[PDB]
Ligand SMILES: O=C(Cn1cnc(NC(=O)c2ccc(Cl)s2)n1)Nc1ccc(-n2ccccc2=O)cc1F
């Protein structure tokens with residue numbers, strides 16, 4: 001994988017480290033077990049519009 | 055905001071508004087966390103005393119979700135100067151924390167290298183605020199947003215009658231009458247990536263608003279990511 005193609009399949013941050021793609025996430029999210037997706041840890045994670053009324 | 059649209063319910067939840075001694079909004083900010091607001095250093099010289107309102111979409115209507123927070127600490131960039139408008143960035147720490155809720159949520163800070171390679175290379179970003187609706191006009195009572203194309207630095211420099219530093223970038227349109235304007239200053243420029251919005255700029259200055267041959271000038275947040283982290287301790 002390369003970050004230049006589909007962002008290395010990462011939801012958020014992509015880096016090519018030790019010549020290999022590693023995904024990561026902003027504060028308030030945890031990187032999923034699949035190592036690609038970013039899972040919010042709270043109901044108002046940064047950068048999400050507030051569309052579901054709670 | 056000149057042109058653009060009213061921001062829909064819940065769609066601009068990181069917007070903050072700095073409110074002066076005439077009780078009026080005079081600048082925007084971006085919510086970074088429960089205690090920290092991002093704004094432009096130059097906004098600090100426009101009022102001696104001010105507070106921060108969040109969760110507001112209509113300044114003439116009490117919706118019930120709005121909150122006003124007092125500022126505990128101002129952290130202005132030490133290299134800002136009004137002569138250059140360079141380093142036009144400040145962080146505010148609030149006396150009491152924000153409770154995130156409908157229309158109140160922080161924008162994400164991106165990692166710098168990825169922001170440069172992936173966010174700044176997008177076609178557009180989004181600017182929002184309660185600023186004037188045309189250059190010589192009055193401020194909007196309703197929160198507006200606008201999609202603004204990224205403009206290349208060489209074009210940006212050529213268009214400007216003032217020096218564009220590496221801490222600045224242009225966004226907007228050559229002739230299309232859409233732009234930010236005075237009153238939006240200090241507010242968010244965010245870039246969308248897969249349904250998540252990342253802070254990419256601060257509304258900084260312009261030669262008028264939506265003038266032909268001029269662009270909106272924004273503080274380049276990538277240049278200040280480590281600085282923001284330190285300011286937020
Ligand atoms: O003072 C004003 C008043 N004004 C009138 N119109 C405006 N427009 C806006 O604020 C925006 C438009 C698009 C934006 Cl993004 S922000 N400012 N504008 C300027 C012009 C130039 C400068 N400037 C830039 C670099 C070095 C020195 C210097 O003075 C600052 C301003 F605030």
Ligand SMILES: [Ca+2]
Pocket residue numbers: 110111112113114115116117120
């Ligand atoms: Ca209101």
Ligand code: NA
Pocket residue numbers: 226227228229230264265266267268269
């Ligand atoms: Na223009």
